[PDB]
Ligand binder design. Structure first.
Ligand SMILES: C=C(C(=O)O)[C@@H](C)[C@H]1OB(O)c2cccc(F)c21
Length: 242
């Protein structure tokens, strides 16, 4: 049911990097990873939490639809794309932390905790600031646990509306062509060691879906593009994408 494939380490080593990729073949109900230990190591989710946060915001009416505008608060932040109005689609694309921090404040700690329990999400612990616990609080989730959560989202089985799940899956759209569709979210955990990058989501094929979750050590922001590059080398090797 789980296979270790250490050959994927080469993709990591060729970029002087260390990390884990986890794949799940939905049709065959079989998982593969280069590191069975790290595949099950729980880390801060960082911006991958915008997936559950979006779902909860939509289901509780904090976000009405994917077109509602959240106006910039006028504070100039480091990331230039954040210094403008956003909707749910662009806030996911540009990973606009302050938008989601306000979502979390409006959700509140009681409802946030109850929903993460209902979602079976990671260690289910929201200790910390209600508007930053996914960055520097108590919540921890492993790559295999991310896959468990994403599979429920794919099949509309989370304990929120079908509509909320469809809208979040739309907002996760990252790449599509005549071979595949990727729906995914990146994450970058810098506030608490060890600094890591994430990419989690799935690849839709004509006749199967392959779920993925990867994380890797990320001592500087220079290597953020390796999150997608290394994952794509694995997907290419496994003939999931050409
Ligand atoms: C764009 C991002 C990405 O692609 O990861 C990062 C930089 C962004 O998304 B989160 O992962 C996050 C958390 C704190 C701060 C922060 F700027 C981010």
């Amino acid at each position: 049911e789980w296979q270790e494939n250490k050959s994927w380490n080469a993709h990591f080593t060729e970029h002087k990097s260390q990390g884990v990729v986890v794949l799940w073949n939905e049709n065959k109900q079989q998982g593969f990873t280069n590191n069975l230990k790290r595949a099950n190591q729980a880390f801060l989710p960082a911006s991958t939490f915008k997936i559950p946060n979006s779902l909860i915001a939509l289901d509780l009416g904090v976000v009405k639809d994917e077109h509602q505008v959240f106006k910039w608060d006028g504070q100039t932040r480091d990331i230039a794309t954040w210094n403008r109005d956003h909707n749910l689609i662009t806030a996911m694309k540009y990973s606009v932390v302050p938008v989601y921090q306000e979502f979390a404040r409006q959700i509140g700690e009681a409802r946030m905790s109850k929903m993460l329990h209902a979602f079976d999400y990671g260690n289910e612990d929201i200790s910390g600031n209600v508007d930053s616990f996914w960055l520097d609080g108590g919540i921890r989730i492993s790559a295999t646990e991310q896959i468990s959560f994403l599979r429920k989202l794919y099949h509309n089985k989370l304990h929120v509306s079908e509509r909320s799940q469809r809208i979040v899956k739309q907002a996760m759209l990252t790449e599509a062509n005549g071979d595949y569709i990727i729906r995914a979210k990146t994450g970058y955990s810098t506030r608490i060691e060890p600094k890591i990058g994430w990419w989690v989501g799935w690849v839709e094929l004509d006749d199967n879906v392959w779920f993925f979750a990867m994380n890797m050590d990320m001592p500087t922001s220079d290597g953020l593009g390796l999150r997608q590059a290394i994952t794509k080398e694995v997907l290419k090797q496994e003939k999931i994408i050409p």
